[PDB]
């Protein structure tokens, strides 16, 4: 199935749009956090899709973010970013696709951190 994750840290953020975004792309359940992430990650099983609106939601730590993406990779859970649909197949050569996946994810992690 399709699992969703949403985070906002402070007491003034447009959480609705986010949750509605996760809903938009097919999130049947959504883990919202203001360990919830842990729950989210331990919940997902092989064959599921794990979705966020953006990597910054997932974290703002290069190392950790990468570690988490690798965790999902290990568990064979499809990671998707609602702001990066089609991110999987940019070209049609799965190898290049994988490489680009990595790049994008890393550019984004770095951005998320540096902010």
């Amino acid at each position: 199935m399709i699992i969703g994750y949403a985070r906002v840290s402070s007491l003034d953020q447009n959480l609705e749009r986010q949750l509605e975004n996760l809903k938009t792309f097919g999130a049947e359940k959504i883990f919202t956090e203001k360990p919830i992430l842990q729950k989210a990650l331990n919940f997902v099983e092989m064959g599921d899709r794990f979705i966020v609106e953006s990597i910054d939601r997932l974290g703002r730590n290069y190392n950790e973010v990468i570690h988490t993406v690798n965790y999902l990779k290990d568990k064979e859970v499809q990671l998707m970013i609602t702001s990066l649909p089609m991110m999987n197949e940019v070209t049609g050569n799965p190898l290049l696709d994988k490489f680009m996946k990595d790049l994008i994810i890393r550019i984004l992690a770095m951005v998320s951190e540096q902010e």
Copy 2:
């Protein structure tokens, strides 16, 4: 219309595959050249191909390396095609020109891919 460009260094390279690839992705005409991808000054067929295409046409190759093995040249060629508003397609990269929602990311992707491949092709 759809123009294709095909290049091989020798004849033991499977040129048929390449031509059939260009035909499949819609080549109405194919400019075929037996030559090194090291420069364009020694590639008048490429020149003909490029001068032939006009705004609204599609230009198709099997790989960037087919187009050349020189970063600056390849880049300049890609930009040349962009300026003339000719669609560059790479049949091994079928989903590259697919508008997938966010133009910024898309263009960024293109530039990136093309440059990586340009360098790859050159360094070899």
Copy 3:
């Protein structure tokens, strides 16, 4: 000679730091602008700065985002500087223009970095 360009959206941004950065990396003159990095048409100071620099000069900013928050524009500006043969430097990227042996890789690096940062700056 070394020309610097400095931009801030408001005055609560630490403009002194930026100016001192440009001064340190050798700004003889600094074109200072209070404006959004969303476009150049509303940035005549940038225009003056760009027209001022000539072949042999250095153009220095603290960050690409200072230069703008528009991919195409930034890229076009970088290429503009390249065409006029003016050295673009980013003081936060001091070792970027350092010739480190392999020109191909170097140029590839530049293009890449600059484009990543262009997009970053835009998307924000």
Copy 4:
């Protein structure tokens, strides 16, 4: 210290240049292979430098190559490629440096594989 690794698979390759290359940049010892790699990796300790002439030497498998680079990272051994000196600091912002390290390494791994 500085450890070197060199590989050639077949019976007709310019091994001299390679070994001399590893020698050039300061290789005190060189592991040459036609498990030797295992030896090379288990040999290096914290603080050492591990050097190859090129990533393809190190392998032609995206996954494995990456895994190995991560292994060296874990062990805090500096990886260097004699054809990519200065690769560490392209800009002067260590974060971006790390990111670029990753990129380059991956472009190269992909190239090494696809050939």
